Amino acid sequence: KTQSNSITLGTRAADFVLPDAGGNLFTLAEFKDSPALLVAFISNRCPFVVLIREALAKFAGDYAGQGLAVVAINSNDAQAFPEETLERVGAEVKAYGYGFPYLKDASQSVAKAYGAACTPDFFLYDRERRLVYHGQFDDARPGNGKDVTGADLRAAVDAVLKGKDVGTTQVPSIGCNIKWTAG
């Protein structure tokens, strides 16, 4: 278990090229027309991601067409954790109804460029792809009793889409560490 890193607000979204489980490739240019862009480092089996998985698919669907693009990335080492393969990532999409692209970062170069530390780790960018929110989906944690609402991220997306300032309280997310390959 670890907290997300303190990443300075304003940092530019790093570019990537990453595949989905059909082999389609995605870069930042594929999301260019969406004024808000969420990049989410998640996992197929981490309990902190299991907690919000239904909510995340609902959240992304709710905003599809309102100007939010969501990209999810699984950077976990799938030799060490076979449940994290690209093939499994493809099965997660169908099983949980993910409308957003869910991509595999096999070399972990993208997780390293964003400075992701745990799953889930959420980075929200504005129209010029500057970081405006980095933190928890909401206050829910496995076993803490709180409803999974996505309210912190929702409030941040709403602010971006309405051209307003994101709130300054950003609680770090908590999850399983990214499973870095030995070295």
Q: Identify the helix (H) or strand (E) that includes residue 90.
A: helix 86-96
Residues 55, 137 contacting (CB under 8 angstroms) = yes
* Structural domain total, the chain: 1
- Say what the resolution is, in angstroms: 2.0
Identity at 181, one-letter amino acid code: T
Residues 131, 10 contacting (CB under 8 angstroms) = yes
Reduced DSSP (H G I as helix, E B as strand, rest coil) percent helix, strand, coil of the chain, to 5: 30, 20, 50
Q: Which residues pair with 19 in a beta bridge?
A: 25
Strands 68-74 vs 36-41: parallel, antiparallel or unpaired = parallel
Q: How far apart are CA 142 and CA 126, in angstroms?
A: 30
Domain hosting 68: range is 1-183
CATH code assigned at 170: 3.40.30.10
Exp. method: X-ray
- DSSP code per residue over 17-55: -EE-TT--EE-GGGGTT-SEEEEEE--SS-HHHHHHHHH
Q: And the tokens for 78?
A: 């799938």
